[PDB]
Symmetry: C6
Subunit: 248 residues, 6 copies
């Protein structure tokens, strides 16, 4: 008849790291699933008389610089070039912002197929609003190809031995602020340090994913060649990271 | 026929500390009752073919980091993991914000069953938005497991002999500001000292509760092991408190 | 046929201090009448099978710390304690803010029966949002029991010989700013000096009342014992007043 | 057939100071007429079984401190005293703010019958929100009875020989800022110099009126006794004016 | 079939100063026509049994100080003087602000018949919100009669040999800022330099007009007598202009 | 049955600069097409009994200074001159702002036929809100005719050997800020450096166009004569650019 003994009785519960961590990761909700997208895009591309991969490549390259919403479909140019996009949009039913998980957005297209994106990204790194040169100005050392796109963040794992991934998360973070700086409407008085709270949560959400095993992430990171098999971190990542670590 | 004599006559009323204090504590309203929750959750869990304790554990671990509202049910991840939560939500009828006392919120789930929460909290203390490391940066001395969660505040009693609890209230307060700092939308110019007025009232409301006798609170605090039977305060609590006391 | 001679003719009107002062005090409107409240509360309490005085005591003690509006009837606690209040509310028909003069608000309950309130106030002075200790920090000298509550202000008369009451009005004013400081939503940049204009008008309205003769006010003030029969002002009132007088 | 010759032809128009000045003064619109008020108030007071002068005196004394709008009819006091005002209000049909010229406002009551107002004003000068003492603090020299009320401004003429009136306008202006300071909702950062533009136009409108001949204004000003027959300005007016002249 | 050759072919177009300048001046739109006003006002005045010139004089003198909108028809004065204006308003159908070109506003009345306005302006220059004295304070040298009113600006031509008119435009500009300063609602932090962009466009629009030949403008400017036949600029205009030129 | 292998498999995609660059340029949307305009304007002008070129010249000269929207059709001038524009507007169906790509705006008229615009621009360069003189004040060296209009930006190619075009983009940019400065409603605290983000995207969109081959752009730039056949950059462009490069 007494609530108090059970209420206090919870105390002596046996707690194990692994069970709350294992459950707490798969609690990270349902906002964006990579795996669903590949199935639906594959079905759409197969059914339609066009190659999904060829189309997707165009969609991603469009994504990096053009932004998430293409519905405006207007920005100072001749008609036939933009025309091809419409075919793709109709079958995909892309929607502006984030209406739903099942709804596909181009940034999800980049994220789910991020290795192809890093492959494309190299030549358009300068092409992006953040030039390779402005970025050389920000950090003296030569820039990491792969760590550019904010969606790229999902692959790297913070839980890797020696915590190298942690550094990456910070190191990769700074591009974001500058990219935020370009897309964010107000910049003049804003501080790089504090703004981190916005976009930080999706970034960490990206860090932990059930989609890719650790081996897969390792394969990408060695594939760019930035990290050796001995797992020694590239000088560029940590050295770029010092600016943030100092400035916080 | 004269209002004045009675009006002045109230003056010579015999006043005793104990009667106004005893009545004034049970006046603290009906916003949130721990005891109601245990009865309704027990009934729901028993009636449904699932274990209330096992479910509740998941609900709390979800609560600490995920925030109070789960209805958005969306944040960059694969479907099956989030799926289990829905079953729980339907029977519980959880509602966003604070609509009603009888309505259950997950933070009330943590609060009513706070000892289980402290038991879970240890490994996820780093996992929370405030890392164990950032917190080591804020206070040099090693951190108190139990005093982390803002809902944890309810157990400690300020009225204990030697007023140790008072210190705790201040000492525990600082985590709150930082956690507020993360969840609060605007941080840049805000001051830690002044912001105390928000959340202070529920914190003090937490300090005084009819739910737990003093012995019960003592059992939790000795159970963590932070305080001895001689009731000597851990160095960590007061030493962490000095930062606030100085900075106010 | 000429407007000008009469218009100028008003000039030589015989003016006496006493007649404009006597009329101008009873012009101070009808926002809040103490006397009406005692009659209606007495009728309600007599008609209902409960003691009005016993109930009222609870209502006032609730008033000092809980604020004027109880309709939310919710703040983190168990059900049976708050339950008793409802009975009282139904018969009283209390309304939030200031809708009408006849409508009773709890602060009017405190004001009309302020001597009982000073009698209760002593032990809960620390209990109020402004602690006895913070208040010792603000003023080095030991604090006056009676002069705490902002509603207490009505008793004291500024028109008393030697103008001691004037000092009190200033001296009592500072608690208000701090209490305002707690309840006022924005505090950070606000100045204690300038904010005086808000709440000053009801405070002065309180100073002058037809409800109590001077003898009655004298009885309360000597009853607390703060002022002797020789009418020497307590050191605490004036010494506390110096902070305001300096800071303005 | 040419517009240009006539358009240029206007140039050689014979211009005389007196005709444009004489016409431009009676152009000053129809916002507030003193003369209409005396006729309608006289009719109302005569028709009703009450003395208009006795009532009006109360209405003005109420006006100086209570503000223009009495419709709220509520401010912390007992019922019978405020009750008498209603009778007056019904026959007068007073309206809040400035709805119409024919509509009477209490400040118009003060203005049209301003000599009676100066006669009343002396004892309530301290009583007003600006105390005689605060005003002694602002200006070291002893204060002018008549020049207090902002509505008083209408009598004085700037066009008088030696321009003494001009000084008065400036000298009288400073009370206004302080009174504005009390009634104006925001004071903290506002500057006394710049705020002059608000209320300046009605003040100058007051300076020039067809209602009173110069002799009438002279009669009031000598009647207070502040100015001699030799028309020597009181030391108080100019000496008080130096603060404004310096501070601008 | 190629768009490019014609598109590039436009390049070798023969361009002459006179043809684009001549066309670009008569492109300056249809917001306000002086000539239309004289025809309609002449018809209205002739048809009605009143003299248009006599009426217009009153309308302009009213315009300089009273502002553009007379519809409020209310500002602290006796009835018969304002009464005459109504007759004029009905036939003219004056409208507040700028609704239409055909609609007449009093400032257009001043502008179209600006020489009469300069003739009236002399005695009321002090009468205007900017006193002759404050203006002596701003500029040490004696002030130009004609260059006061902002509507006066239309006559002067910047294109005159030696560019004297240019100086005038700057020199005349400063009165505007001060007049703006009086009518503009917010003054405290505003800068005289930057505010120029507002009202600058109508001012330049005024500088260039098809209404008056250069000879006509010359006739006005020599008629005031400020400029000799040798076209030597008055010391007052340029010397007043130095303040602006320095301060920018 | 596994999503992961294909997802990782995208990595080893063969990436070539030319194919993503070639596709990414014709992705730049459909906001504004030069080529469509020439066809529709040609049809309209041919069908109507007026010369499209003669009309267009007027429309452009109107465009440079008058702004994009002519619908207000009102700004302080006589009727017949503005009248001719209406005929043109009806057939063209010009619309304010940017409603549609097919909709023609006058700035598109300038852009598509920009060589004619540079031909007109020379004499009206001073005529524009930014005077030739203020511009001499900003940059000591003599100003480039062609690089003035913001719409002029489309011709120059950044991809030219030695990157001279890049300099131009920066060098030409500064006029824009000043022109923005005039048309932009708020200027006082704004910074030239940061404001670049607005209008930068259409400027770069202008830099890359499928409309003109490189030879065509070369023809314009040598035609103005600012750049020799040896492709040596004019001193004016780079020397003007130093101010921006320093100030950023
Ligand atoms: Na085509
Ligand atoms: Na599945
Ligand atoms: Na119960
Ligand atoms: Na009664
Ligand atoms: Na009359
Ligand atoms: Na005509």
């Amino acid at each position: 008849e007494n609530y108090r003994d059970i209420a206090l009785a919870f105390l002596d519960e046996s707690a194990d790291s692994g069970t709350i961590n294992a459950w707490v990761n798969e609690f990270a909700y349902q906002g964006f699933d990579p795996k669903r997208i590949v199935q639906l895009v594959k079905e759409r591309g197969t059914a339609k008389g066009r190659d999904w991969k060829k189309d997707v490549k165009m969609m991603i390259v469009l994504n990096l610089v053009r932004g998430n919403k293409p519905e405006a479909m207007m920005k100072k140019m001749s008609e036939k070039g933009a025309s091809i996009v419409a075919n793709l949009i109709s079958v995909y039913q892309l929607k502006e912002g984030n209406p739903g998980r099942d709804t596909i957005t181009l940034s999800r297209v980049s994220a789910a197929f991020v290795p192809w994106t890093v492959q494309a990204l190299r030549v358009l790194s300068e092409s992006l609003p953040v030039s390779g040169t402005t970025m050389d100005a920000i950090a003296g050392v030569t820039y990491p190809r792969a760590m550019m796109h904010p969606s790229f963040a999902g692959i790297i794992d913070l839980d890797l031995p020696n915590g190298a991934g942690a550094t990456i998360a910070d190191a990769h973070g700074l591009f974001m602020i500058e990219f935020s700086k370009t897309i964010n409407p107000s910049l003049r008085t804003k501080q790089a340090n504090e703004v981190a709270a916005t976009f930080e949560k999706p970034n960490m959400a990206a860090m932990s994913g059930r989609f890719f095993t650790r081996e897969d992430k390792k394969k990408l990171l060695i594939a760019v060649g930035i990290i050796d098999e001995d797992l020694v971190l590239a000088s560029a990542v940590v050295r770029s990271a010092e600016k943030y670590r100092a400035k916080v």
